[PDB]
Design an enzyme around this catalytic site. Sequence first.
Site, PDB file in Angstrom:
ATOM      1  N   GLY A 155       0.929  -1.232   0.071  1.00 52.76           N
ATOM      2  CA  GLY A 155       0.090  -0.107   0.000  1.00 52.76           C
ATOM      3  C   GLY A 155       0.766   1.127  -0.086  1.00 52.76           C
ATOM      4  O   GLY A 155       2.038   1.115  -0.476  1.00 52.76           O
ATOM      5  N   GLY A 200       5.339   7.219   1.763  1.00 49.79           N
ATOM      6  CA  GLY A 200       5.933   6.429   0.574  1.00 49.79           C
ATOM      7  C   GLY A 200       5.207   5.135   0.287  1.00 49.79           C
ATOM      8  O   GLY A 200       4.218   4.781   1.001  1.00 49.79           O
ATOM      9  N   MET A 201       5.812   4.104  -0.410  1.00 46.02           N
ATOM     10  CA  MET A 201       5.480   2.896  -0.913  1.00 46.02           C
ATOM     11  C   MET A 201       5.533   1.678   0.204  1.00 46.02           C
ATOM     12  O   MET A 201       6.828   1.672   0.797  1.00 46.02           O
ATOM     13  CB  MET A 201       5.674   2.519  -2.240  1.00 46.02           C
ATOM     14  CG  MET A 201       5.237   1.218  -2.657  1.00 46.02           C
ATOM     15  SD  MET A 201       5.669   0.782  -4.397  1.00 46.02           S
ATOM     16  CE  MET A 201       4.346   1.657  -5.228  1.00 46.02           C
ATOM     17  N   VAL A 202       4.807   0.786   0.702  1.00 51.58           N
ATOM     18  CA  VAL A 202       5.137  -0.400   1.318  1.00 51.58           C
ATOM     19  C   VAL A 202       5.010  -1.476   0.584  1.00 51.58           C
ATOM     20  O   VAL A 202       3.963  -1.807  -0.290  1.00 51.58           O
ATOM     21  CB  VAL A 202       4.296  -0.545   2.577  1.00 51.58           C
ATOM     22  CG1 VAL A 202       4.787  -1.714   3.584  1.00 51.58           C
ATOM     23  CG2 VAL A 202       4.421   0.758   3.436  1.00 51.58           C
ATOM     24  N   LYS A 227       9.271  -0.159   3.994  1.00 53.80           N
ATOM     25  CA  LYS A 227       8.714   0.886   3.728  1.00 53.80           C
ATOM     26  C   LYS A 227       9.809   1.852   3.045  1.00 53.80           C
ATOM     27  O   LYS A 227      10.834   2.045   3.578  1.00 53.80           O
ATOM     28  CB  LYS A 227       8.221   1.777   4.854  1.00 53.80           C
ATOM     29  CG  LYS A 227       7.218   1.185   6.232  1.00 53.80           C
ATOM     30  CD  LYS A 227       7.040   2.089   7.177  1.00 53.80           C
ATOM     31  CE  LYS A 227       8.118   2.359   8.154  1.00 53.80           C
ATOM     32  NZ  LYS A 227       7.918   3.747   9.161  1.00 53.80           N
ATOM     33  N   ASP A 253      -0.328   9.850  18.681  1.00 55.68           N
ATOM     34  CA  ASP A 253      -1.083   9.351  17.872  1.00 55.68           C
ATOM     35  C   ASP A 253      -1.556   7.656  17.614  1.00 55.68           C
ATOM     36  O   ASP A 253      -1.833   7.026  16.729  1.00 55.68           O
ATOM     37  CB  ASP A 253      -0.541   9.635  16.242  1.00 55.68           C
ATOM     38  CG  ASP A 253      -1.540  10.018  15.062  1.00 55.68           C
ATOM     39  OD1 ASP A 253      -2.726   9.956  15.440  1.00 55.68           O
ATOM     40  OD2 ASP A 253      -1.173   9.724  13.810  1.00 55.68           O
TER      41      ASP A 253
END
EC number: 2.7.11.24
Length: 345
Positions: A22, A24-26, A41, A136
Amino acid sequence: PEMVRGQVFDVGPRYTNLSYIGEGMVCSAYDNLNKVRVAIKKISPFEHQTYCQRTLREIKILLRFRHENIIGINDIIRAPTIEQMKDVYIVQDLMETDLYKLLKTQHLSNDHICYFLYQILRGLKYIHSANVLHRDLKPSNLLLNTTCDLKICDFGLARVADPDHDHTGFLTEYVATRWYRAPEIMLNSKGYTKSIDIWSVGCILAEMLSNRPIFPGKHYLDQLNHILGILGSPSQEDLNCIINLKARNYLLSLPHKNKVPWNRLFPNADSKALDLLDKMLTFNPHKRIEVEQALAHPYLEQYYDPSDEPIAEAPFKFDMELDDLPKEKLKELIFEETARFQPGY
């Protein structure tokens, strides 16, 4: 360099067999050294001050911390020089899912609720013992593997606790996920005390019990009125604790609301779970239960063992002076923080 559904994802030779997860990009990848699949990641932060700060913060924190309920960093891949470094890849244990995804489609047994809550609080005890606030916590930041071991992730908004400097005016803007924010954030608090994490964990408990967020505010002040619709109007004593006139007078202006009993909102819940929920979702942050007390609550007696609930060896005494630091110095600190993972270090 291997490519993934669009872009460069350049983590070879050690990691192969990439699969998009999913954005940045994983991706997951196969770790040729440890012979296990891992999560990677890709982070590209160096254009932007704020990303530099969040990435540095997360790396410095996760590298220091070592705890079964906090995600570790296994490896960090980047170029050998600061000039050539454009992206950084962070390698972590692959986790089957997270609590956000699970709650979207799975009902949790009371036993799962209890075990998940225990692991969230065990990890949080360690985090707060290092004088750090996560700030968070939410279901998507709680990762779960196939055997339901739980690990807290995403320390991009974490700060060193600073209670002497927590006061602020009414409606002061805030960065953390809205539905998990404690009511004082909207009234008079910068979220620099450990109580703002306990409130988030209470909202997570509530969400485990019903699969729906308990306070799904649609905007900044809506979040406060969701909270008050359930907890009811704060007491005289609790208002007297808020000295700021704009915030107290706003509360005074609202029509009286009575408490919605937890057992009406959660009629299938264990009564001990609701007693602990009530103590975590307590309006006055000074009266809110702390993490060690929560661990010791009867709902968790099957698990509680403070000799197996370890704390950090040393506090993070300083807040990382990262707020007013240029991105160039930040890239340099990131380069230094990631050095230990370079070949033949």
